[PDB]
Design an enzyme around this catalytic site. Structure first.
Site, short mmCIF file in Angstrom:
data_model
loop_
_atom_site.label_atom_id
_atom_site.label_comp_id
_atom_site.label_asym_id
_atom_site.label_seq_id
_atom_site.Cartn_x
_atom_site.Cartn_y
_atom_site.Cartn_z
N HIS A 67 0.82 -1.22 0.00
CA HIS A 67 0.00 0.00 0.00
C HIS A 67 0.84 1.25 0.00
O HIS A 67 1.59 1.50 0.93
CB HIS A 67 -0.92 -0.03 1.22
CG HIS A 67 -1.81 1.16 1.30
ND1 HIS A 67 -3.18 1.08 1.21
CD2 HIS A 67 -1.49 2.47 1.46
CE1 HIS A 67 -3.63 2.34 1.28
NE2 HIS A 67 -2.64 3.19 1.43
N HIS A 112 -5.29 -8.31 -1.04
CA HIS A 112 -6.13 -7.51 -1.90
C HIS A 112 -7.01 -8.40 -2.75
O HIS A 112 -7.26 -8.11 -3.93
CB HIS A 112 -5.29 -6.49 -2.72
CG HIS A 112 -6.01 -5.23 -3.03
ND1 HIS A 112 -7.30 -5.15 -3.51
CD2 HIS A 112 -5.63 -3.92 -2.89
CE1 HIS A 112 -7.64 -3.88 -3.64
NE2 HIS A 112 -6.65 -3.10 -3.26
N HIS A 400 -8.81 5.87 -1.54
CA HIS A 400 -7.40 5.57 -1.78
C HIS A 400 -7.17 5.33 -3.25
O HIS A 400 -7.97 4.68 -3.92
CB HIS A 400 -7.03 4.30 -0.99
CG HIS A 400 -5.69 3.74 -1.33
ND1 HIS A 400 -4.52 4.45 -1.24
CD2 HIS A 400 -5.34 2.52 -1.75
CE1 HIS A 400 -3.53 3.66 -1.64
NE2 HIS A 400 -3.99 2.46 -1.95
N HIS A 402 -4.24 3.84 -5.90
CA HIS A 402 -2.99 3.13 -6.13
C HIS A 402 -2.08 3.93 -7.12
O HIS A 402 -2.55 4.73 -7.90
CB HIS A 402 -3.27 1.76 -6.75
CG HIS A 402 -3.97 0.78 -5.86
ND1 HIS A 402 -3.62 -0.54 -5.92
CD2 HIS A 402 -4.98 0.86 -4.96
CE1 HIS A 402 -4.42 -1.21 -5.09
NE2 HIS A 402 -5.25 -0.39 -4.47
N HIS A 452 -10.55 3.45 -4.78
CA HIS A 452 -11.66 2.85 -4.06
C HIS A 452 -11.71 3.34 -2.64
O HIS A 452 -10.74 3.80 -2.07
CB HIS A 452 -11.54 1.31 -4.08
CG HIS A 452 -10.32 0.76 -3.43
ND1 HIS A 452 -10.25 0.47 -2.09
CD2 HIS A 452 -9.13 0.40 -3.96
CE1 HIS A 452 -9.03 -0.02 -1.84
NE2 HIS A 452 -8.31 -0.08 -2.96
N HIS A 454 -11.43 2.53 1.09
CA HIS A 454 -10.60 1.55 1.79
C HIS A 454 -11.30 0.92 2.99
O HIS A 454 -10.69 0.12 3.70
CB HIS A 454 -9.24 2.13 2.19
CG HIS A 454 -8.12 1.13 2.08
ND1 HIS A 454 -8.05 0.00 2.85
CD2 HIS A 454 -6.99 1.12 1.33
CE1 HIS A 454 -6.95 -0.66 2.52
NE2 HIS A 454 -6.26 -0.01 1.61
N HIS A 458 -16.90 -2.02 1.89
CA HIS A 458 -17.46 -1.17 0.84
C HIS A 458 -16.83 -1.45 -0.51
O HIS A 458 -17.52 -1.46 -1.53
CB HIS A 458 -17.28 0.32 1.23
CG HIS A 458 -17.99 0.71 2.47
ND1 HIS A 458 -17.85 2.00 2.97
CD2 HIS A 458 -18.81 0.01 3.27
CE1 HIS A 458 -18.60 2.03 4.06
NE2 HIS A 458 -19.19 0.86 4.27
N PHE A 463 -17.51 -0.27 -4.31
CA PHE A 463 -17.17 1.19 -4.25
C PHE A 463 -15.77 1.45 -4.83
O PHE A 463 -14.82 1.77 -4.10
CB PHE A 463 -17.31 1.69 -2.84
CG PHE A 463 -17.75 3.14 -2.67
CD1 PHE A 463 -18.29 3.90 -3.70
CD2 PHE A 463 -17.72 3.71 -1.39
CE1 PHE A 463 -18.80 5.15 -3.46
CE2 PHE A 463 -18.21 4.96 -1.15
CZ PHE A 463 -18.77 5.69 -2.18
CU LIG Z 1 -16.67 3.44 2.27
CU LIG Z 2 -4.25 -0.51 1.24
CU LIG Z 3 -3.01 0.91 -2.30
CU LIG Z 4 -6.72 -1.07 -3.37
F LIG Z 5 -0.95 2.07 -3.29
#
Ligand SMILES: [Cu+2]
Ligand SMILES: [Cu+2]
Ligand SMILES: [Cu+2]
Ligand SMILES: [Cu+2]
Ligand SMILES: [F-]
Ligand SMILES: *[C@@H]1O[C@H](CO)[C@@H](O[C@@H]2O[C@H](CO)[C@@H](O)[C@H](O)[C@H]2NC(C)=O)[C@H](O)[C@H]1NC(C)=O
Ligand SMILES: *[C@@H]1O[C@H](CO)[C@@H](O[C@@H]2O[C@H](CO)[C@@H](O)[C@H](O)[C@H]2NC(C)=O)[C@H](O)[C@H]1NC(C)=O
Length: 497
Positions: A67, A112, A400, A402, A452, A454, A458, A463
């Protein structure tokens, strides 16, 4: 006992009892949380993940995301299932081989795939800076100064019943804490400090859902890092930390030798501290081995407010200083109804062929990419603005992205944007009804990047969208190893797809 940057990491099932209640789990490195993966800025990480899972109640497939690490040129190593890879099947392994140029700070890793990280596959990931500009602000920064905050459930993630409210059963601080109901006096975590020293505490939310109001009785906290981004020093006495966020703060061990409560109050689940829920212990060397007797204030004097944070470096804000002042200005319609979330009217359901593989196979606009309506193309070398107006049930939602961090041009609970010096981060609360939290970044990282909420429940309920950044350059930018190419055929064979 940190591992990496070159390491094996075995993913297993085991029973654990972090709040005195035994349940099976999905673990990295045999522990909850998993071991800290660490290295220095610019290092090559080679994390060979061995999937040894056998219990189908928590899924026997897995995939791990690192992450906040940008994965530039290594989109295939990012980890989100059906976005950048097919899952690793049981009895197989996969080498996540990537580099961390230009990043240093506090990160984490997690499953994930589905809601599997809630079942235990979560741990810290620290990228140290040998030339850290903040180094002179503290004396100690090591595995003993990492503080994880976790929600823990007695019910298995896959077994959470359809149509019933999901809340946690315990808050775990450094893996330990007490259950909200049927509380037993199970061990609390102890964080030990020496009077007179200064500590870089690396506060990591590994939450699947709640945000926490984090404080330390008698102490204050000087924030120096936000989601990997060095900040100007900001002294606070409480931090509201949302799922997946990180802060470093300097803790000055400047109170009398003694015991002090560490508090992490979730926004759902048990309220307060009866029986030592929501608690850990800050113990000075030489203190009696006993519980603290300290109390919180009724009202905190200096809570963190996100607009008070500013980068240490002169990061600015890309684009022009007004709404829509970007090359590609977006406004997402974020909604919830009938158990499903949607973005611009489309609920995310993972595709059969990972988005990256679809692109490598020649799908070259986002209209051609599955899931239909869930993949949005971004142009290269462009300023992107994304407004994320709140209102959807289940908030406040920590969104969040990526592959990127971003300038937080507008924060929760404050209608005024900041085009001068807002903090940059990678996970941001979108706030409450009528808010218009807005982020900006520049597209210099070709590949499909997940966006999305996090709150993992959700995400599972749709989401999310995928930003297919610079589709035309994705294949040339991200050469893939044979082991990656082997993932989908192995997965689809195992699952009779
Ligand atoms: Cu949410
Ligand atoms: Cu994460
Ligand atoms: Cu991430
Ligand atoms: Cu993600
Ligand atoms: F990330
Ligand atoms: C959040 O900010 C965005 C812009 O960043 C607003 O978007 C505008 O929305 C109106 C309709 O509501 C459109 O006519 C404009 O074309 C949009 N872009 C602009 C002005 O740059 C959005 O309305 C804001 N949302 C909330 C809830 O405040
Ligand atoms: C609401 O957000 C705005 C924008 O981030 C904050 O305004 C800044 O306040 C600082 C501190 O007084 C000033 O130095 C800046 O010039 C302000 N910037 C702008 C664009 O107005 C504001 O402080 C926030 N409100 C609260 C209550 O914290």
């Amino acid at each position: 006992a940190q591992i990496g940057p070159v390491t094996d990491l075995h993913i297993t099932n085991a029973n654990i009892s972090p709040d005195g209640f035994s349940r099976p789990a999905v673990l990295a490195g045999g522990t909850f949380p998993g071991p800290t993966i660490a290295g220095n800025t610019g290092d090559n990480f080679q994390i060979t993940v061995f999937n040894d899972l056998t219990d189908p109640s928590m899924l026997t497939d897995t995939s791990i995301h690192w992450h906040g690490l940008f994965q530039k040129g290594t989109n295939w190593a990012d980890g989100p299932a059906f976005v950048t890879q097919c899952p690793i099947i049981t009895g197989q392994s996969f080498d996540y081989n990537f580099n961390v140029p230009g990043q240093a700070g506090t990160f984490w890793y997690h499953s994930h795939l589905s809601t599997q990280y809630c079942d235990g596959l979560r741990g810290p990931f620290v990228v140290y800076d040998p030339n850290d500009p903040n180094a002179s602000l503290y004396d100690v920064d090591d595995d003993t100064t990492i503080i994880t905050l976790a929600d823990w459930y007695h019910t298995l993630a896959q077994q959470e019943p359809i149509g019933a409210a999901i809340t946690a059963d315990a808050t775990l601080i450094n893996g330990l804490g007490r259950s909200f109901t049927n509380t037993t006096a199970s061990p609390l975590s102890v964080i030990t400090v020496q009077s007179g020293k200064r500590y870089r505490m690396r506060l990591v939310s590994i939450s699947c859902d709640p945000n926490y109001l984090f404080s330390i009785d008698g102490h204050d906290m000087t924030i120096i890092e936000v989601d990997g981004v060095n900040s100007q020093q900001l002294t606070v006495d409480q931090i509201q930390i949302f799922a997946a966020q990180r802060y470093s703060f300097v803790l000055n061990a400047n109170q009398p030798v003694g015991n002090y409560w560490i508090r992490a109050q979730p926004n759902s689940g048990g309220q307060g501290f009866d029986g030592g829920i929501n608690s850990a212990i800050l113990r000075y060397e030489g203190a009696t081995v006993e519980d603290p007797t300290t109390t919180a204030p009724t009202t905190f004097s200096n809570p963190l407010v996100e607009t008070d944070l500013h980068p240490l470096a002169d990061l600015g804000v890309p684009g022009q200083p007004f709404r829509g002042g970007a090359d590609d200005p977006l406004v997402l319609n974020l909604a919830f109804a009938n158990g499903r979330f949607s973005i611009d009217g489309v609920s995310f359901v993972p595709p059969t062929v990972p988005v990256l593989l679809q692109i490598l196979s020649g799908a070259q606009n986002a209209q051609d990419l599955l899931p239909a309506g869930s993949v949005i193309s971004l142009p290269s070398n462009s300023v992107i603005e994304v407004a994320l107006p709140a209102g959807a049930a289940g908030g406040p939602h920590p969104f969040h992205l990526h592959g990127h961090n971003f300038a937080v041009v507008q924060s929760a609970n404050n209608a005024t944007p900041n085009y001068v010096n807002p903090i940059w981060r990678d996970t941001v609360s979108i706030g409450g009804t009528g808010d218009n939290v807005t982020i900006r970044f520049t597209t210099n990282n070709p590949g499909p990047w997940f966006l999305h909420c996090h709150i993992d429940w959700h995400l599972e309920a749709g989401f999310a969208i995928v930003f297919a950044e610079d589709i035309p350059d994705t294949a040339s930018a991200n050469p893939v190893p044979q082991a990656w190419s082997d993932l989908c055929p192995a997965y689809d064979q195992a699952h009779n797809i």
